[PDB]
Amino acid sequence: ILPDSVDWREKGCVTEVKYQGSCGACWAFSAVGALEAQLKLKTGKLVSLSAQNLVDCSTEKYGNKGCNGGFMTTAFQYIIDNKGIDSDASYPYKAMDQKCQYDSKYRAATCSKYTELPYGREDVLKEAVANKGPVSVGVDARHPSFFLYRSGVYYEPSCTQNVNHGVLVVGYGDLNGKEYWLVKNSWGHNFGEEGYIRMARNKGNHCGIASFPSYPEIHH
Amino acid sequence: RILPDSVDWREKGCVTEVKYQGSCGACWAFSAVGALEAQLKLKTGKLVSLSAQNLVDCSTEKYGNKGCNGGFMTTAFQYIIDNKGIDSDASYPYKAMDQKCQYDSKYRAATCSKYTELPYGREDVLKEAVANKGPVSVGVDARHPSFFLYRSGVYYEPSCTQNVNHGVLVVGYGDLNGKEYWLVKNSWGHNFGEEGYIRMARNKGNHCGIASFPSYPEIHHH
Numbered sequence: 001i002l003p004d005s006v007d008w009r010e011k012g013c014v015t016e017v018k019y020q021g022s023c024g025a026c027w028a029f030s031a032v033g034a035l036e037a038q039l040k041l042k043t044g045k046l047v048s049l050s051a052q053n054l055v056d057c058s059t060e061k062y063g064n065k066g067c068n069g070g071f072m073t074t075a076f077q078y079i080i081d082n083k084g085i086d087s088d089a090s091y092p093y094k095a096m097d098q099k100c101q102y103d104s105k106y107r108a109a110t111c112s113k114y115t116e117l118p119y120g121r122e123d124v125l126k127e128a129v130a131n132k133g134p135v136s137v138g139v140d141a142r143h144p145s146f147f148l149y150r151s152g153v154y155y156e157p158s159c160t161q162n163v164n165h166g167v168l169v170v171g172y173g174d175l176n177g178k179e180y181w182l183v184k185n186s187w188g189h190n191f192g193e194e195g196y197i198r199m200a201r202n203k204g205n206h207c208g209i210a211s212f213p214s215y216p217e218i219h220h
Numbered sequence: 221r222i223l224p225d226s227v228d229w230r231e232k233g234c235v236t237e238v239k240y241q242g243s244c245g246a247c248w249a250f251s252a253v254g255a256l257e258a259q260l261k262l263k264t265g266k267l268v269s270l271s272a273q274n275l276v277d278c279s280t281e282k283y284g285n286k287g288c289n290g291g292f293m294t295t296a297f298q299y300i301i302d303n304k305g306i307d308s309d310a311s312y313p314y315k316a317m318d319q320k321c322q323y324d325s326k327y328r329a330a331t332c333s334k335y336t337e338l339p340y341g342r343e344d345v346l347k348e349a350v351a352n353k354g355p356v357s358v359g360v361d362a363r364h365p366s367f368f369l370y371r372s373g374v375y376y377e378p379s380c381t382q383n384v385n386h387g388v389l390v391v392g393y394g395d396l397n398g399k400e401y402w403l404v405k406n407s408w409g410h411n412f413g414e415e416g417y418i419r420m421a422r423n424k425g426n427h428c429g430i431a432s433f434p435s436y437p438e439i440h441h442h
C-alpha cells in the first residue's frame with residue numbers, strides 16, 4: 001500500500017532550487033536533481049551536482065544540444081560512460097554552452113544504471129516516487145499559465161502530452177483532496193511556490209507528467 | 221559477448237515484406253509494427269503484417285504522436301497495450317494520411333504485454349537483444365544525401381550524427397568484407413537500397429545514432 005503523500009525535501013534528499021537563466025538546460029537540472037537524491041541515499045551527503053558538466057560534455061554523442069535541449073536518460077548514460085559527474089561547486093553553472101571541462105579529480109557522484117518508467121502510468125510514477133526517490137520527468141510547460149503559476153494545484157485545460165521541459169518530481173499529495181505531483185523547477189526560488197509547482201495528478205497524465213519518467217541509481 | 225557472429229531474422233520467417241510509407245512521416249509506426257510482427261510469429265507461428273495506419277490514426281495526442289508528422293515506437297507499443305490490440309494491415313490498410321481512429325477488435329491480429337527500451341548507445345546490448353529477443357525498433361539519422369542514394373555494401377557517412385529523425389527496424393547484423401553492419405529494414409519500398417534494406421556500420425561509435433533509442437515489444441503467454 002503506497003503512502004497518501006510523499007515529500008523528499010523532508011528526507012534531506014533535495015538541493016536548493018537552481019536558476020537555468022536563458023539556457024534550455026532543464027534536462028540537465030532534472031538529471032542532476034534525481035542523482036542528487038540517490039547520492040544522499042548512498043553517502044548521507046546532500047551535494048548539488050554540476051548541470052554545467054552535462055551541458056558541456058553530454059553533447060552530440062548523447063543526442064543533446066546543451067542550451068538547446070536534451071534528455072535526462074542520455075545525461076545518466078553520459079555519467080555512466082564518463083565514470084562520474086563533478087560537483088556544482090567545482091564546475092559551476094554559467095547558462096552557456098562551453099567546452100567539456102570535466103575532471104575526475106572533482107567527481108562528486110557515479111551512476112550505475114537508469115530506469116525509464118512505462119508511458120503515461122501515474123500509478124507506476126507514484127510507486128517509483130514513494131519507493132525509489134525523486135523522478136526526472138518531462139512536462140508540457142508551453143502555456144502562459146505555467147509561467148504565471150504562483151500557488152495551489154496547477155491544471156491547464158490546453159495542456160498536452162507534447163512535453164518540452166525537464167523537471168523533478170520530489171513528492172505527491174493532495175490539497176483538500178485535489179491530488180498533485182510536487183515538482184522542483186529550475187526557474188529560481190522566486191518561481192511559483194518558492195521554486196516548486198504542484199501539478200494535477202490522476203488527471204489523465206496532465207501536461208504529460210508521466211509520459212517519460214526516469215530515475216538513476218548508484219552501485220552498492 | 222557470447223552471441224552469434226551474424227543474425228538475419230528473415231531466415232526465421234519473422235520479417236514481413238518491405239512497406240512504402242509514401243509522403244507520410246509514419247516510419248515510427250512501421251518500425252513499431254515490424255518489431256511486433258516478429259514477436260507475433262515467434263509466439264503463434266504466423267507471419268502477419270500489422271496495421272501501421274491503425275497506429276497513425278489511433279496512437280495520437282495521448283501517446284505524444286502526430287501521425288504523418290512523426291511519433292515514437294515506445295508510445296506506439298503502449299497504445300497497443302492500452303488498446304488491448306492492433307488490427308492486421310489487411311483489415312486496416314495504409315493510406316499515407318491521417319484518418320479518424322477506425323480500430324475494431326473484430327480485426328485484431330496482435331497484442332502487446334510490455335516493451336523494453338535499451339540503454340543509450342550500447343551496440344553490444346543491441347547485439348544481444350537482436351540475437352536473443354528478435355528485431356529491434358531504432359531511430360537513425362537518415363537526413364544525409366548519401367542515405368537516399370544507398371545501393372549496396374556497408375553504409376558509413378562521416379557527416380552522420382546521433383540526431384535521429386527516422387524510425388526503422390534492425391532485423392540482423394553481421395560482417396561484409398571486414399565491415400561489421402546492422403541489417404536495417406526501411407519503409408521506403410523495395411526500390412530503396414538492397415530491396416528495402418540498408419546495412420549500416422556497426423561498432424563505429426553508434427553511427428547515425430542506430431543504438432541511441434532501441435526498443436522491442438513482447439507478447440505474454442496469457
Ligand SMILES: CNC(=O)CCS(=O)(=O)N1CCN(c2ccc3nncn3n2)CC1
Nearest residue numbers: 024027069070071137138163164165166212
Ligand atoms: C529544452 N527542453 C528540454 O531539453 C526538455 C526535454 S523533456 O524533459 O521535455 N523530455 C525529455 C524526455 N523525452 C523523451 C522522449 C521520448 C522518450 N522515450 N523514452 C524516453 N523518452 N524521453 C522528451 C523530452
Ligand SMILES: CNC(=O)CCS(=O)(=O)N1CCN(c2ccc3nncn3n2)CC1
Nearest residue numbers: 245248290291292358359384385386387433
Ligand atoms: C517522422 N519521424 C519519426 O517519426 C521518427 C522518430 S525516431 O524513430 O527517429 N525516434 C524515436 C525514438 N525517439 C526517442 C527519443 C528519446 C528517447 N529517450 N528514450 C527513448 N527515446 N526515444 C527519438 C525519435
